[PDB]
């Protein structure tokens, strides 16, 4: 299903993005906001809560320095560009995927993203389990889970 996703364009010029928030269970956080937002290009210039200072530009690569700078000063969710909000031509641009996971530098043009994503999703399998491997298989297929009240 993801064999056709290949980075063909460098920049798309899209200004839209998706809000990213950290996960929290009660009074503790499971994943830090810096680790979740790291590796993606910022969609819009994030403003420091309280103090009127621009810590990050509008569209810039979120490096480790910017990462722990955003993590130090408390900040809410920041709009970040993603592959789902891209509106480019056939394929995917390098301005929405973000930093590559195999290498520290950004992703290069022509690299297959769908195949590596499918391989990374299938790698942690065989060690799972109301959730687990059948739950993930049902969620990816988007079938009817059970009779639930319509919104």
């Amino acid at each position: 299903v993801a064999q056709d996703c290949i980075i063909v364009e460098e920049d798309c010029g899209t200004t839209k993005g998706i809000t990213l928030r950290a996960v929290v269970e009660g009074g503790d956080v499971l994943v830090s906001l810096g680790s979740r937002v790291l590796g993606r290009f910022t969609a819009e210039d994030v403003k420091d809560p309280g103090t009127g200072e621009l810590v990050v530009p509008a569209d810039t690569y979120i490096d480790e320095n910017i990462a722990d700078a955003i993590e130090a000063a408390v900040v809410q969710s920041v709009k970040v560009r993603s592959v789902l909000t891209c509106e480019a031509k056939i394929g995917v641009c390098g301005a929405c995927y973000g930093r590559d996971l195999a290498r520290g530098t950004p992703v290069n043009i022509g690299e297959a993203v769908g195949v590596i994503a499918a391989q990374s999703i299938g790698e942690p399998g065989t060690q799972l389990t109301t959730g687990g491997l059948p739950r993930v298989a049902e969620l990816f297929e988007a079938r009817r889970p059970k009779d639930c009240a319509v919104i």
Partner: protein, 33 residues
């Protein structure tokens, strides 16, 4: 399945080079009529 270069990475760069070469050849042929 057909046994051609995959359009990813090296294949994509080679296809881009072939496209730019075809464009240059067309530009050269336009002036020669």
């Amino acid at each position: 399945i057909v046994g051609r270069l995959i359009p990813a990475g090296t294949g994509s760069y080679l296809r881009s080079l072939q496209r730019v070469a075809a464009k240059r050849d067309e530009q050269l042929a336009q002036q020669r009529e």
